[PDB]
Design an enzyme around this catalytic site. Structure first.
Site, short mmCIF file in Angstrom:
data_model
loop_
_atom_site.label_atom_id
_atom_site.label_comp_id
_atom_site.label_asym_id
_atom_site.label_seq_id
_atom_site.Cartn_x
_atom_site.Cartn_y
_atom_site.Cartn_z
N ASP F 146 29.23 -6.10 54.10
CA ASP F 146 30.17 -5.13 53.90
C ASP F 146 29.92 -3.96 52.61
OD1 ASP F 146 32.63 -3.39 54.10
OD2 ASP F 146 33.75 -4.89 55.43
N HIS F 219 30.92 0.52 65.55
CA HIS F 219 31.35 0.75 64.51
C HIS F 219 30.47 1.86 63.57
CE1 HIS F 219 34.13 0.92 60.88
NE2 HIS F 219 33.16 0.48 60.17
#
Ligand code: HEM
Ligand code: HEM
Ligand code: HEM
Ligand code: HEM
Ligand code: HEM
Lengths: 304, 306, 306, 305, 306, 306
Positions: F146, F219
């Site tokens: 991330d 995403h």
């Protein structure tokens, strides 16, 4: 008796050196054996405490008879070739093993250079591998590698010769095999299918439960229980190696144990199979190209 | 313009990968070049901040003509062979260079694997070297290596193309040479004789005074002043490599500069000599077995392709 | 199972050596401090763990022992003996208490030294205070790696700690200290090869010279001693550089721990008085001793229970 | 212009060397000055990146005229003695300053040894201090020391000579003073009383509010505003030093600024006082035994000699 | 012979304390998890070695022991005893299982806790969960260094591990936990000198107050306990700060390990019930206990053999 | 030159997110604290340098701005806009002030939060407090790396800092925060390859999926946005895991910084309302937003001059 540094802290770099002793080279070898602990201190001391440099020296079965008279270690013999229905574990020549480990490859290389400098003219190199571990203890297959190794007292009991062979107490037996992997075929498996080959989850390194773990997974075939129901254990320090240009992606296997019987039982299960498992599925992605067995004496045996 | 990571923090591991582009392989190469920065982040980001992973991508003169149809960088040409009275600097094939650096060899290896995975079938490997620095910045001859590199603003000025070639601003030029050493002959010299070859003290890395430093020492021949009396500088990141079994002990030389003329002037002095010096004495213990020249474009030049 | 002081310390890069004499009437104040010194060490050190690596080893001289304590004396405790060789002399200087303070940083050593001397003000007279610093690659002021052949593990405990031979004082040790000043100008006029012949090891790589080439009057040859039974007699050393550039003082502070002072004293006799094959230790042609003292360092619980 | 490493990363060890130039010593000094940056790289490069070795070289007012012909930096003059009603800021001799910093004292010492080796016979040592910072950036008085130093562009603006003296751009002015403390008297104060002397909380290093901070506290008297209402700032790298045997507990003060007038205004307020404050209370526990002023040129000025 | 759990851990800067009760019918699921907890610890922690320093210590309460196991009980296992003093109370709260999870980083603690509670969902009910962190100079929420007088080495093993007095359970230990919330506003209205009188040590330097000036109701005086035989009775503590700035919760999570619960309980009696010269420990005027539980932490091989 | 707050921070492994509302009458107290917050950051952080890396970014919401200040407002400042999609909803929740506190250790964050809340006691009410920790390989609670494609260097400054388009507020930024809870049971029922199709990158190696396999509702596809002029519109994220094992709460705290809220809002619209080719971001089938707020983070000198 003081052992060699078989039980080393975790290291991220290694050099494996396997050589044969030329005719006439015996005296030069014996001299180097008596100095190798002093060489390890010389190269390593000024880089402490981060360097973590150690050398473990081993001697093969044929070489032992050439170098020494008197008693032999009870379990020392040449590596036994295994000719399975599909997969083969080859035997390759090797009289001396130098297993050199540190936190950095340059320290390994400097010690290797001093050792080979003393032996030039007396030995012939058979193999040289420079290993590096991935930063999360993963191997070339992408699995964490080392997890179930014994530690502390359990490691000493599994690895060091004791009262059963008292002249050689504090020694150990090392088996080495260089493996090359078929990474293209491995990467065509789903992650779940890879997990079924190894016997553990890939990301989290949790063992599969007994109800899901296949009988021909690597973990199932290399789990061995002794007469008394206890686990028979070995200590491994497998290292990745390779060359991107020649498409060579490898695992250098090294396993230490108090008797070669443990390690050899594991290898027979993997290569020959059992009633419930044809062979270890890791071998459908892994070919052995070397195989040798060595006795690693106690440090004070070498110092004489 | 954003440069590639030519000016890297200090790294202890590297991979140098040199390849040639096979006939028909151009489109696959152009694709990979547009993705190489994204690959660097994918492999490197999760090992921050200690990983220090970077890749510098370079393109040779003949490869440039095959890949790109517009303007050429002003200084890009094939490496020029130097045929001296005693020593030779060879020119060898190389279309792409990947200079990969990190704090650990495994990070270099993972990035190299992803790069070569994309290029399989479009390129032929010419050289692959895994380098490691000794813990006190020494090279295979036992001397500290890097000391007089420029740093800060002086490094940027010496290395990055600017106004003189504005369409290629933020680029640099790299020269690579793989050297093999004769360590038996080197180790037969006294320390003081070694110091006279290099031009610096061995243990303390203090430069020899002007009255003692020979004219054929490495430091004397690679010290060059410009028209205006200023020092001309390059940025080096030399790496040891080798194999103890095969008796291979090497230095992989890489030098970055804003124009190849600086690097080439240094090499001419080393191999062909001057009025006062027949050749660089380091070459009596060092043989060049490769030689190639590459342009390393600005990062945004690579990103904006098809 | 008696608990030793931190004689066997991890590697430390800073030290303070403090030697004092006990003034007339100072005995009671000293006894009080001795019972508290381990608690002071924890107070200063605990909040800088685990990187601080603070320890203090406290020693007591032969004459001071008789003033502080009634009952048994350690068997090997006596005043340091002067050695008057043909060329070189090992002096004896006064010292009743030693504080050997080590850490990874000088400021931690200083804070402990300040608390100790604060408690003793008015009861002691300082004789010597040295602030030591080790070079980053374990080298001393002569440029050689220093500590390499120290014993480790079980072999160190066997060489250093008093055992069954003197059971009331088991877990203790004996420390000899000598402050040495060097002639650095003369040292640096030697070639590296000649320096290697003085020490007995290679300078850059710290490999011991082979038995056929190692001179008989090299430091390593003279301080290698075998016992009656052919075993190596070993001591544990933690030598520290010190000095002042303004005063031209460049020193080595020698400290050696052993289970009996006989081992250390035999080494000193060989260095200063020579053997059949060696007039003296060549290191002494560049090194002058200006202090000399001997201390017993009791088990930690001996100090606590007092 | 490339400055010297006046703006250094935080370092835990230092050597301060102050010397005078003997009769006939000028040529030897000029030679050393032209080499000092190369000496710094020689000692430091092989211990990178943890070593963090730097050397800042300074030159006094009288020494400047002996070494160089032509232009002088505008603000360079000898240290001005301040003879206050109670406390005195002394001037002592000094022609050259070497401010050597690293993460470890041995690196400082190695560089100092090479510098003094080149100058032997040409200089006379006046002061030599080996400094060490406590592990939580505290000084000998037990307070955090360095907190309100400027950083980044604000530091460059406060410290480096610019357009106002363009031939000497990238230089700076250093003032040094060695202070010895009366630690027995300091430690007889309560913590709360020590906080009132400094102007900050001892454990947490939070500044006392303007309504509680006494006017004679160190922080109040060294807070100075310019013509424009802007804060006048300096960059400090104070170091503890001492000797337990001799009962010597010290702070070696060093302050860098773009003009000496900022630092001198701070010294006047500390030693001579203001309308509301007789003197800086820190001086009731701290005696200055040296004082000197130096100009630290841009690196390229030294290199070109 | 018996392998202990990691009660004697290196210093760690993060921890998770998880206390649960075993739901009716949950015993079999719990027994299965207990036999796997060491395998889970290796699975989560091995890939972060050697810096991760992850360990879990598992404890079992008195009532739960009888539900899980037949055969021998550890001699000292009983429910925590409530102490009802004139002013302060030590409450007993329910708790069947303790998981004391420590590492150098909170994420490792969290991952192991996630795997443990994953296996136990449906078989246990959480009673308390605390995430602890150390201040960088080993200070607690009161601003004092916390841990200084803990035993180390051999003395720690002797104070903490069950031995021959209960040989079936050798290598085990007893853990007492208490969560404390502090009144920080009242504490911060004290002068530093008044805080020092509460604790019994100097605040900035952590030096113990002299015997003459240390109050009898200071924390250090009341928790210093001598045995019949004159010896110090010691425990091993690993207290951790915790809290929530928005809810004004500033806490110390107390955990104390000892070879027998009697030592810890004698300390608690002195703190809460007082002595002839001290009504109670002054630290309790600024600290309220909101949990209290006692657990036996078996040898590692006892858990493995299930 | 306006000096920004530390929006572009180095990588940190710990954070505290504190969101409060300003009580009636609390304006004056808040203005005083805002003028001191950089001084508090230095006070707490200086003594842990250089490893601490403590920073505080302060944000102010639209309604609070109008209560605190008169005159011109930042052009893009408005309350968070609720998104009511066919399946998924982005809620707006109350929040006047944001403190985004980051460091290499949680205790530094906690100490600064404690000093901030100490000064505001009585004038604000806490709405949210989250203590975040990063996994050691930059992974989030879903097991994916991330932060990989965050912009860096000059590209980050261009994406994040207000410039000439709103010159009175140059050097500021806009932060959007959303606390997400994950349904980990549902997530872990997917195969790895199905997880990869939700995110758009490979899980172990963090290589982006090729454009020919990457789904339109992944995403990464929905948060990739180009401007009219062909340029990538980028934001700077510093997402942190958080949770509580006993309550089965596993979260990601989302924070995104941008030069205008329009970039962030365009991304949120695509995620929650969909596009022609995608109903919604598949990450939201495993992720529920429980907070949503928008803040302007002024230049540092705006806060100082209050
Ligand atoms: C291609 C070569 C090899 C690879 C890539 C490999 C990789 C691994 C992996 C990933 C594990 C799981 C984690 C762990 O280390 O516990 C494992 C376990 C193990 N492997 Fe291997 N391995 C190889 C060869 C061998 C060989 C040749 C032997 C024995 C002769 C062996 C013995 C073991 C043992 C004993 C374990 C522990 C099993 C357990 O009890 O859980 N391995 N190996
Ligand atoms: C065998 C190959 C080589 C080795 C081992 C080597 C080694 C060294 C060493 C030890 C130094 C002194 C310390 C330092 O400043 O780095 C040095 C300096 C230098 N070398 Fe090399 N070098 C090699 C080849 C080259 C080549 C091929 C070039 C240029 C084409 C070059 C250019 C330089 C430069 C510019 C310096 C800096 C001299 C100064 O300004 O003081 N070197 N090299
Ligand atoms: C000027 C003072 C001294 C210096 C600079 C110094 C330096 C050295 C060095 C560099 C070595 C080689 C590396 C090593 O093994 O540590 C060495 C070894 C040693 N020194 Fe010293 N030394 C000093 C004084 C002493 C003294 C006074 C003694 C004994 C009383 C002593 C006993 C030893 C011993 C036993 C060895 C190891 C020999 C072996 O077994 O290989 N040294 N010293
Ligand atoms: C006598 C030895 C000295 C000691 C122990 C000392 C100590 C301190 C301490 C603890 C601080 C507070 C934390 C900090 O901001 O650094 C401080 C601040 C400062 N000191 Fe000193 N100091 C001394 C001398 C001086 C001198 C001589 C000057 C100026 C010529 C000076 C100028 C300052 C300045 C400017 C500050 C920052 C003030 C502000 O907050 O703006 N100090 N000092
Ligand atoms: C609010 C809860 C507590 C806090 C903040 C706290 C804090 C401290 C501090 C600051 C010290 C001095 C430094 C040290 O040696 O660690 C100390 C010592 C000690 N504490 Fe506590 N403590 C607490 C509760 C307890 C409890 C409940 C016990 C026993 C049941 C205990 C037993 C001890 C012991 C044995 C010592 C060492 C005393 C010595 O022999 O010097 N503490 N504690």
């Amino acid at each position: 008796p003081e052992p060699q540094m078989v039980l080393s802290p975790l290291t991220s770099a290694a050099i494996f050196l396997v050589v044969t002793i030329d005719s006439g080279g015996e005296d030069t070898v014996r001299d180097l054996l008596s100095d190798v602990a002093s060489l390890e201190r010389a190269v390593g001391f000024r880089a402490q405490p981060d360097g973590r440099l150690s050398c473990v020296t081993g001697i093969g079965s044929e070489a032992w008879d050439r170098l020494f008279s008197g008693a032999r270690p009870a379990g020392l013999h040449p590596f036994r070739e295994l000719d399975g229905p599909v997969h083969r574990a080859v035997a390759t020549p090797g009289d001396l093993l130098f297993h050199i480990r540190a936190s950095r490859l340059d320290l390994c290389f400097a010690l290797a250079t001093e050792i080979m400098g003393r032996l030039r003219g007396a030995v012939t190199p058979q193999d040289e591998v420079h290993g590096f571990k991935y930063f999360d203890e993963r191997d070339m297959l992408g699995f964490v590698d080392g997890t179930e190794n014994p530690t502390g007292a359990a490691a000493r009991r599994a690895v060091l010769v004791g009262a059963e062979d008292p002249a050689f107490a504090g020694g150990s037996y090392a088996v080495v095999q260089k493996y090359l992997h078929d990474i293209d075929a491995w990467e065509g498996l789903s992650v779940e299918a890879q997990e079924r080959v190894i016997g553990r989850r890939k990301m989290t390194d949790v063992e599969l439960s007994d109800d899901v773990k296949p009988a021909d997974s690597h973990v199932a075939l290399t789990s061995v229980t002794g007469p008394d129901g206890s686990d028979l254990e070995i200590l491994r320090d497998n290292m990745p190696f390779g060359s991107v240009g020649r498409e060579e992606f490898g695992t250098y296997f090294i396993g230490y144990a108090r008797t070669p019987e443990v390690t050899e039982t594991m290898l027979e299960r993997m290569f020959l199979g059992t009633a419930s498992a044809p062979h270890d599925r890791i071998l459908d992605f892994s070919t052995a190209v070397t195989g040798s067995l060595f006795f690693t004496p106690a440090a004070d045996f070498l110092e004489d």
